[PDB]
Amino acid sequence: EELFNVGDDVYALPGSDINLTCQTKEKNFLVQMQWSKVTDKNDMIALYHPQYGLYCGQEHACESQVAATETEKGVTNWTLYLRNISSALGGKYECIFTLYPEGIKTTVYNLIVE
């Protein structure tokens, strides 16, 4: 359902530094969350589980690329640090919360690099 549009376009010139931040739905239990780069396959960047903690996708030092933070009304922020953006970092980024009782909630960012 997300491969129709849904997401937000994000333009950048090479060299740019950009933070993407995603936010949990109110009044849900946070079950797990993750960041992915979406091509033909969904390639996970980092995953956070509220008990097991951080887990990275393939060789990463991803603890320097993501951060989770709680705020006021149980809402959680989930952010991805993009640094020194090349055309290779361009593409579709997907933040996927799995919540209870509402299930999956996803936010798509299209990073466009000139």
Ligand X SMILES: *[C@@H]1O[C@H](CO)[C@@H](O)[C@H](O)[C@H]1NC(C)=O
List residues near another protein by CB under 8 A. Answer: 48-56, 58-61, 63-64, 67-68
Residues that bind ligand X (CB under 6 A): 83-84
Q: How far is the CB of 9 from another protein (least distance, A)?
A: 29
d(CA 17, CA 34): 21
Phi, psi of 13 (to 5 degrees): -85, 155
Does a cis peptide bond (omega within 30 degrees of 0) precede residue 101? yes
Q: How far is the CB of 84 from ligand X (least distance, A)?
A: 4
Give the one entry of another protein, ligand X, none that residue 84 binds, where binding means its C-beta sits below a cut-off of 5 to 8 angstroms depending on kind: ligand X
